[PDB]
Amino acid sequence: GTILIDLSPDDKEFQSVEEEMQSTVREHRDGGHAGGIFNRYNILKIQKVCNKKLWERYTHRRKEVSEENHNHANERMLFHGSPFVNAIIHKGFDERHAYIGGMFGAGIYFAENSSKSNQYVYGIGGGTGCPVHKDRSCYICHRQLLFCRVTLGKSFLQFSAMMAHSPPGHHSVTGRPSVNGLALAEYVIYRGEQAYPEYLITYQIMRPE
Ligand SMILES: Cc1cc(O)nc2ccccc12
Ligand SMILES: [Zn+2]
């Protein structure tokens, strides 16, 4: 069902996606433990993910959420990092993509910081790093992130000192760091139909000079 369309680096669409990747790197309080040490990426490819069935599933749910929230989907573009990126683009988000041990409950997590999503590319806490070199900071192996369209509807705001169901009458959770003033928010959804994996970004983290 899914096809992947390569975007040309000359297309404005590739350019705005790359910009959202690069401009939302930040430093991490683990010193690079999970995701590696870097200030920027080498973007290698950006693909558009196309799946008629998955799209209609997303927009069906989006209209429902919109209806329960003063006609407002509260739709965002947010990063998602996971070892299951290949299953998500073909079969969609579902409960196996949920993070049972997560702070904001057992749901599917997205990040405004591309570098926060990068910490999950090889597993929770970076797992054991890349498959080939077991290196969480690997500068050689190609990584992949999704940049997804996410319906948040009415989002329960949970301040943070950094499959379950949304709090009653909410459609998602906003996990908002309240200590690190430069950390952007994370969002958790509890229905896989509330995210559509729009872009597939292949990249390397770059060793700082
Ligand atoms: C916080 C977070 C961001 C992300 O992009 N992926 C995750 C995948 C699993 C668990 C958490 C995650
Ligand atoms: Zn490697």
PDB file of C-alpha atoms and ligand atoms in Angstrom:
ATOM      1  CA  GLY A   1       0.000   0.000   0.000  1.00  0.00           C
ATOM      2  CA  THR A   2       2.832   2.398   0.766  1.00  0.00           C
ATOM      3  CA  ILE A   3       4.994   4.125  -1.782  1.00  0.00           C
ATOM      4  CA  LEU A   4       7.914   6.424  -1.020  1.00  0.00           C
ATOM      5  CA  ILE A   5       8.575   9.495  -3.223  1.00  0.00           C
ATOM      6  CA  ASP A   6      12.072  10.883  -3.132  1.00  0.00           C
ATOM      7  CA  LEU A   7      12.206  14.637  -2.664  1.00  0.00           C
ATOM      8  CA  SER A   8      14.846  16.599  -4.587  1.00  0.00           C
ATOM      9  CA  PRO A   9      17.110  18.695  -2.348  1.00  0.00           C
ATOM     10  CA  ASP A  10      16.104  21.573  -4.714  1.00  0.00           C
ATOM     11  CA  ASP A  11      12.405  21.214  -3.851  1.00  0.00           C
ATOM     12  CA  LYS A  12      11.145  23.748  -1.250  1.00  0.00           C
ATOM     13  CA  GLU A  13       9.485  20.841   0.580  1.00  0.00           C
ATOM     14  CA  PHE A  14      12.829  19.026   1.162  1.00  0.00           C
ATOM     15  CA  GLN A  15      14.239  22.299   2.289  1.00  0.00           C
ATOM     16  CA  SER A  16      11.567  23.129   4.879  1.00  0.00           C
ATOM     17  CA  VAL A  17      11.724  19.544   6.260  1.00  0.00           C
ATOM     18  CA  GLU A  18      15.524  19.723   6.520  1.00  0.00           C
ATOM     19  CA  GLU A  19      15.243  23.097   8.213  1.00  0.00           C
ATOM     20  CA  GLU A  20      12.835  21.726  10.849  1.00  0.00           C
ATOM     21  CA  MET A  21      15.380  18.849  11.525  1.00  0.00           C
ATOM     22  CA  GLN A  22      18.435  21.087  11.838  1.00  0.00           C
ATOM     23  CA  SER A  23      16.815  23.980  13.756  1.00  0.00           C
ATOM     24  CA  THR A  24      15.409  21.772  16.528  1.00  0.00           C
ATOM     25  CA  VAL A  25      18.632  20.043  17.615  1.00  0.00           C
ATOM     26  CA  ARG A  26      19.496  20.959  21.195  1.00  0.00           C
ATOM     27  CA  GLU A  27      22.004  19.739  23.752  1.00  0.00           C
ATOM     28  CA  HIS A  28      20.856  16.780  25.906  1.00  0.00           C
ATOM     29  CA  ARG A  29      21.340  16.429  29.653  1.00  0.00           C
ATOM     30  CA  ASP A  30      22.782  12.891  29.179  1.00  0.00           C
ATOM     31  CA  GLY A  31      25.827  14.424  27.494  1.00  0.00           C
ATOM     32  CA  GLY A  32      24.995  12.480  24.298  1.00  0.00           C
ATOM     33  CA  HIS A  33      24.646   9.095  26.012  1.00  0.00           C
ATOM     34  CA  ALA A  34      21.404   7.993  24.259  1.00  0.00           C
ATOM     35  CA  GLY A  35      21.596   9.760  20.889  1.00  0.00           C
ATOM     36  CA  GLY A  36      25.272  10.635  20.438  1.00  0.00           C
ATOM     37  CA  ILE A  37      27.259  13.878  20.455  1.00  0.00           C
ATOM     38  CA  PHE A  38      26.338  16.329  17.655  1.00  0.00           C
ATOM     39  CA  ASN A  39      25.027  19.837  16.857  1.00  0.00           C
ATOM     40  CA  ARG A  40      23.704  19.070  13.390  1.00  0.00           C
ATOM     41  CA  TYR A  41      22.845  16.388  10.825  1.00  0.00           C
ATOM     42  CA  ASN A  42      23.952  15.361   7.317  1.00  0.00           C
ATOM     43  CA  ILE A  43      20.571  14.819   5.665  1.00  0.00           C
ATOM     44  CA  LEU A  44      20.914  11.992   3.108  1.00  0.00           C
ATOM     45  CA  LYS A  45      17.387  11.563   1.774  1.00  0.00           C
ATOM     46  CA  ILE A  46      13.898  12.749   2.466  1.00  0.00           C
ATOM     47  CA  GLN A  47      11.011  10.640   1.318  1.00  0.00           C
ATOM     48  CA  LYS A  48       7.308  11.398   1.202  1.00  0.00           C
ATOM     49  CA  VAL A  49       5.291   8.399   2.524  1.00  0.00           C
ATOM     50  CA  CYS A  50       2.112   7.732   0.499  1.00  0.00           C
ATOM     51  CA  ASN A  51      -0.563   5.298   1.604  1.00  0.00           C
ATOM     52  CA  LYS A  52      -4.178   5.913   0.671  1.00  0.00           C
ATOM     53  CA  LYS A  53      -5.567   3.583   3.358  1.00  0.00           C
ATOM     54  CA  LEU A  54      -3.404   4.947   6.129  1.00  0.00           C
ATOM     55  CA  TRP A  55      -4.160   8.565   5.060  1.00  0.00           C
ATOM     56  CA  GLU A  56      -7.954   8.010   5.137  1.00  0.00           C
ATOM     57  CA  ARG A  57      -7.618   6.294   8.494  1.00  0.00           C
ATOM     58  CA  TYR A  58      -5.801   9.395   9.798  1.00  0.00           C
ATOM     59  CA  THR A  59      -8.229  11.967   8.345  1.00  0.00           C
ATOM     60  CA  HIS A  60     -11.244   9.954   9.488  1.00  0.00           C
ATOM     61  CA  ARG A  61     -10.027  10.138  13.045  1.00  0.00           C
ATOM     62  CA  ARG A  62      -8.929  13.751  12.547  1.00  0.00           C
ATOM     63  CA  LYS A  63     -12.545  14.826  11.718  1.00  0.00           C
ATOM     64  CA  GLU A  64     -13.782  13.052  14.850  1.00  0.00           C
ATOM     65  CA  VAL A  65     -11.273  14.732  17.110  1.00  0.00           C
ATOM     66  CA  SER A  66     -11.948  18.069  15.365  1.00  0.00           C
ATOM     67  CA  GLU A  67     -15.686  17.647  16.238  1.00  0.00           C
ATOM     68  CA  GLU A  68     -15.035  17.124  19.984  1.00  0.00           C
ATOM     69  CA  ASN A  69     -12.716  20.068  20.186  1.00  0.00           C
ATOM     70  CA  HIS A  70     -14.574  23.279  19.144  1.00  0.00           C
ATOM     71  CA  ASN A  71     -13.822  22.312  15.431  1.00  0.00           C
ATOM     72  CA  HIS A  72     -10.074  22.218  16.092  1.00  0.00           C
ATOM     73  CA  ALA A  73      -7.860  19.220  15.275  1.00  0.00           C
ATOM     74  CA  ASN A  74      -4.822  20.884  16.836  1.00  0.00           C
ATOM     75  CA  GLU A  75      -2.693  19.277  14.156  1.00  0.00           C
ATOM     76  CA  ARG A  76       1.113  19.466  14.469  1.00  0.00           C
ATOM     77  CA  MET A  77       4.183  18.245  12.561  1.00  0.00           C
ATOM     78  CA  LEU A  78       6.356  16.325  15.044  1.00  0.00           C
ATOM     79  CA  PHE A  79       9.325  13.955  15.017  1.00  0.00           C
ATOM     80  CA  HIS A  80       9.143  10.278  15.823  1.00  0.00           C
ATOM     81  CA  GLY A  81      12.261   8.108  16.354  1.00  0.00           C
ATOM     82  CA  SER A  82      12.015   4.307  16.582  1.00  0.00           C
ATOM     83  CA  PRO A  83      13.589   1.041  15.495  1.00  0.00           C
ATOM     84  CA  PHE A  84      10.195   0.168  13.895  1.00  0.00           C
ATOM     85  CA  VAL A  85      10.178   2.889  11.254  1.00  0.00           C
ATOM     86  CA  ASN A  86       9.905   0.237   8.505  1.00  0.00           C
ATOM     87  CA  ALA A  87       6.771  -1.286  10.099  1.00  0.00           C
ATOM     88  CA  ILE A  88       5.152   2.137  10.818  1.00  0.00           C
ATOM     89  CA  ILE A  89       5.419   3.375   7.206  1.00  0.00           C
ATOM     90  CA  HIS A  90       3.779   0.147   5.838  1.00  0.00           C
ATOM     91  CA  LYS A  91       1.249  -0.790   8.482  1.00  0.00           C
ATOM     92  CA  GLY A  92       0.776   2.539  10.350  1.00  0.00           C
ATOM     93  CA  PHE A  93       1.153   3.451  14.051  1.00  0.00           C
ATOM     94  CA  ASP A  94      -0.406   1.029  16.580  1.00  0.00           C
ATOM     95  CA  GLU A  95       0.035  -0.256  20.172  1.00  0.00           C
ATOM     96  CA  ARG A  96       3.417  -1.971  19.541  1.00  0.00           C
ATOM     97  CA  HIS A  97       4.794   1.515  18.867  1.00  0.00           C
ATOM     98  CA  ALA A  98       3.627   2.643  22.316  1.00  0.00           C
ATOM     99  CA  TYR A  99       6.118   3.179  25.096  1.00  0.00           C
ATOM    100  CA  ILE A 100       4.738   1.219  28.039  1.00  0.00           C
ATOM    101  CA  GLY A 101       7.291   2.681  30.443  1.00  0.00           C
ATOM    102  CA  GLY A 102       6.848   6.291  29.409  1.00  0.00           C
ATOM    103  CA  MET A 103       6.433   9.253  31.784  1.00  0.00           C
ATOM    104  CA  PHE A 104       3.159  10.448  30.287  1.00  0.00           C
ATOM    105  CA  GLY A 105       1.595   7.039  30.139  1.00  0.00           C
ATOM    106  CA  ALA A 106       1.562   4.071  27.735  1.00  0.00           C
ATOM    107  CA  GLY A 107       1.118   5.797  24.387  1.00  0.00           C
ATOM    108  CA  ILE A 108       2.963   6.758  21.199  1.00  0.00           C
ATOM    109  CA  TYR A 109       5.518   9.573  21.815  1.00  0.00           C
ATOM    110  CA  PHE A 110       6.436  12.479  19.461  1.00  0.00           C
ATOM    111  CA  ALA A 111       8.933  15.307  19.938  1.00  0.00           C
ATOM    112  CA  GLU A 112       9.320  18.917  18.843  1.00  0.00           C
ATOM    113  CA  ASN A 113      13.095  18.465  19.241  1.00  0.00           C
ATOM    114  CA  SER A 114      14.419  16.327  16.353  1.00  0.00           C
ATOM    115  CA  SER A 115      17.362  15.478  18.630  1.00  0.00           C
ATOM    116  CA  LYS A 116      15.003  14.084  21.308  1.00  0.00           C
ATOM    117  CA  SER A 117      13.522  11.661  18.647  1.00  0.00           C
ATOM    118  CA  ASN A 118      17.051  10.799  17.603  1.00  0.00           C
ATOM    119  CA  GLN A 119      17.653   9.401  21.100  1.00  0.00           C
ATOM    120  CA  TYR A 120      15.098   6.597  20.337  1.00  0.00           C
ATOM    121  CA  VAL A 121      16.195   5.594  16.827  1.00  0.00           C
ATOM    122  CA  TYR A 122      18.178   2.587  18.208  1.00  0.00           C
ATOM    123  CA  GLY A 123      15.719   1.826  21.067  1.00  0.00           C
ATOM    124  CA  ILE A 124      14.806   3.176  24.510  1.00  0.00           C
ATOM    125  CA  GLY A 125      17.734   5.218  25.819  1.00  0.00           C
ATOM    126  CA  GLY A 126      19.493   4.558  22.459  1.00  0.00           C
ATOM    127  CA  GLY A 127      19.488   0.737  23.229  1.00  0.00           C
ATOM    128  CA  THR A 128      22.978  -0.524  22.318  1.00  0.00           C
ATOM    129  CA  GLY A 129      23.513   1.954  19.449  1.00  0.00           C
ATOM    130  CA  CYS A 130      23.879   1.121  15.745  1.00  0.00           C
ATOM    131  CA  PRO A 131      23.590  -2.549  14.686  1.00  0.00           C
ATOM    132  CA  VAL A 132      27.076  -2.610  13.036  1.00  0.00           C
ATOM    133  CA  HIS A 133      29.314  -0.911  15.568  1.00  0.00           C
ATOM    134  CA  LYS A 134      27.182  -0.957  18.811  1.00  0.00           C
ATOM    135  CA  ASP A 135      27.835   2.784  18.994  1.00  0.00           C
ATOM    136  CA  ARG A 136      25.061   5.159  20.275  1.00  0.00           C
ATOM    137  CA  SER A 137      27.130   8.059  18.852  1.00  0.00           C
ATOM    138  CA  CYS A 138      27.829   6.382  15.473  1.00  0.00           C
ATOM    139  CA  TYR A 139      28.777   8.946  12.726  1.00  0.00           C
ATOM    140  CA  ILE A 140      28.916   6.351   9.902  1.00  0.00           C
ATOM    141  CA  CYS A 141      25.637   4.361  10.002  1.00  0.00           C
ATOM    142  CA  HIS A 142      22.554   5.818   8.337  1.00  0.00           C
ATOM    143  CA  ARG A 143      19.749   6.712  10.810  1.00  0.00           C
ATOM    144  CA  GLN A 144      16.053   7.240  10.015  1.00  0.00           C
ATOM    145  CA  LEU A 145      13.402   9.498  11.703  1.00  0.00           C
ATOM    146  CA  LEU A 146       9.747  10.120  10.774  1.00  0.00           C
ATOM    147  CA  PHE A 147       8.332  13.658  10.593  1.00  0.00           C
ATOM    148  CA  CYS A 148       4.646  13.001  11.253  1.00  0.00           C
ATOM    149  CA  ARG A 149       1.298  14.807  11.027  1.00  0.00           C
ATOM    150  CA  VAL A 150      -0.175  14.406  14.530  1.00  0.00           C
ATOM    151  CA  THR A 151      -3.740  15.237  15.649  1.00  0.00           C
ATOM    152  CA  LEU A 152      -3.555  16.430  19.352  1.00  0.00           C
ATOM    153  CA  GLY A 153      -7.191  17.564  19.733  1.00  0.00           C
ATOM    154  CA  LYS A 154      -7.666  18.735  23.300  1.00  0.00           C
ATOM    155  CA  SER A 155      -4.339  18.049  24.924  1.00  0.00           C
ATOM    156  CA  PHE A 156      -3.871  17.547  28.646  1.00  0.00           C
ATOM    157  CA  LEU A 157      -0.978  19.662  29.798  1.00  0.00           C
ATOM    158  CA  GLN A 158       1.421  17.864  32.003  1.00  0.00           C
ATOM    159  CA  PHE A 159       4.408  19.840  33.203  1.00  0.00           C
ATOM    160  CA  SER A 160       7.416  17.666  33.508  1.00  0.00           C
ATOM    161  CA  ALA A 161      10.328  18.091  35.749  1.00  0.00           C
ATOM    162  CA  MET A 162      12.887  17.481  32.855  1.00  0.00           C
ATOM    163  CA  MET A 163      -2.255   1.050  25.370  1.00  0.00           C
ATOM    164  CA  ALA A 164      -3.693   3.486  27.913  1.00  0.00           C
ATOM    165  CA  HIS A 165      -6.263   6.179  27.135  1.00  0.00           C
ATOM    166  CA  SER A 166      -6.130   9.982  27.106  1.00  0.00           C
ATOM    167  CA  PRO A 167      -7.350  11.634  30.335  1.00  0.00           C
ATOM    168  CA  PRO A 168     -11.199  12.011  30.310  1.00  0.00           C
ATOM    169  CA  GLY A 169     -12.321  14.377  27.515  1.00  0.00           C
ATOM    170  CA  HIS A 170      -8.704  14.700  26.130  1.00  0.00           C
ATOM    171  CA  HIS A 171      -7.210  13.336  22.904  1.00  0.00           C
ATOM    172  CA  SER A 172      -3.492  13.465  23.801  1.00  0.00           C
ATOM    173  CA  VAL A 173      -0.969  14.515  26.412  1.00  0.00           C
ATOM    174  CA  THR A 174       1.507  17.366  26.238  1.00  0.00           C
ATOM    175  CA  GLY A 175       4.619  16.643  28.210  1.00  0.00           C
ATOM    176  CA  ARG A 176       6.175  20.074  28.700  1.00  0.00           C
ATOM    177  CA  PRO A 177       9.635  20.340  30.277  1.00  0.00           C
ATOM    178  CA  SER A 178       9.577  22.888  33.091  1.00  0.00           C
ATOM    179  CA  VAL A 179      13.281  22.766  34.197  1.00  0.00           C
ATOM    180  CA  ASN A 180      15.350  22.845  31.004  1.00  0.00           C
ATOM    181  CA  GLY A 181      14.116  26.180  29.490  1.00  0.00           C
ATOM    182  CA  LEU A 182      15.447  25.142  26.039  1.00  0.00           C
ATOM    183  CA  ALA A 183      13.839  21.702  25.867  1.00  0.00           C
ATOM    184  CA  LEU A 184      10.772  21.616  23.604  1.00  0.00           C
ATOM    185  CA  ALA A 185       7.587  19.584  24.333  1.00  0.00           C
ATOM    186  CA  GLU A 186       6.702  15.927  23.762  1.00  0.00           C
ATOM    187  CA  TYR A 187       3.258  14.726  22.911  1.00  0.00           C
ATOM    188  CA  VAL A 188       1.633  11.308  23.527  1.00  0.00           C
ATOM    189  CA  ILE A 189      -1.315   9.978  21.626  1.00  0.00           C
ATOM    190  CA  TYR A 190      -3.271   6.784  22.562  1.00  0.00           C
ATOM    191  CA  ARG A 191      -4.777   5.974  19.166  1.00  0.00           C
ATOM    192  CA  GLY A 192      -2.463   5.097  16.296  1.00  0.00           C
ATOM    193  CA  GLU A 193      -4.921   6.697  13.860  1.00  0.00           C
ATOM    194  CA  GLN A 194      -3.994  10.088  15.295  1.00  0.00           C
ATOM    195  CA  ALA A 195      -0.584  10.218  13.551  1.00  0.00           C
ATOM    196  CA  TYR A 196       0.354   9.877   9.852  1.00  0.00           C
ATOM    197  CA  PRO A 197       4.043   9.276   9.088  1.00  0.00           C
ATOM    198  CA  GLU A 198       4.337  11.938   6.320  1.00  0.00           C
ATOM    199  CA  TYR A 199       8.149  12.011   5.761  1.00  0.00           C
ATOM    200  CA  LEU A 200      10.907   9.493   6.167  1.00  0.00           C
ATOM    201  CA  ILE A 201      14.246  11.236   6.822  1.00  0.00           C
ATOM    202  CA  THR A 202      17.511   9.354   6.346  1.00  0.00           C
ATOM    203  CA  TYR A 203      20.566  11.022   7.913  1.00  0.00           C
ATOM    204  CA  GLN A 204      23.766  10.814   9.890  1.00  0.00           C
ATOM    205  CA  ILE A 205      24.582  12.768  13.035  1.00  0.00           C
ATOM    206  CA  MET A 206      27.769  14.832  12.388  1.00  0.00           C
ATOM    207  CA  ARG A 207      30.848  14.827  14.630  1.00  0.00           C
ATOM    208  CA  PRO A 208      31.320  18.412  15.961  1.00  0.00           C
ATOM    209  CA  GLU A 209      34.442  20.314  14.761  1.00  0.00           C
TER     210      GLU A 209
HETATM  211  C1  LIG B   1       9.933  10.400  23.579  1.00  0.00           C
HETATM  212  C2  LIG B   1       9.995   9.605  22.256  1.00  0.00           C
HETATM  213  C3  LIG B   1      10.192  10.340  21.079  1.00  0.00           C
HETATM  214  C4  LIG B   1      10.256   9.605  19.860  1.00  0.00           C
HETATM  215  O1  LIG B   1      10.441  10.287  18.723  1.00  0.00           O
HETATM  216  N1  LIG B   1      10.129   8.247  19.813  1.00  0.00           N
HETATM  217  C5  LIG B   1       9.948   7.505  20.961  1.00  0.00           C
HETATM  218  C6  LIG B   1       9.798   6.108  20.905  1.00  0.00           C
HETATM  219  C7  LIG B   1       9.624   5.330  22.078  1.00  0.00           C
HETATM  220  C8  LIG B   1       9.541   5.991  23.294  1.00  0.00           C
HETATM  221  C9  LIG B   1       9.655   7.395  23.360  1.00  0.00           C
HETATM  222  C10 LIG B   1       9.869   8.183  22.198  1.00  0.00           C
HETATM  223 ZN    ZN B   2      27.635   2.342  13.271  1.00  0.00          ZN
END
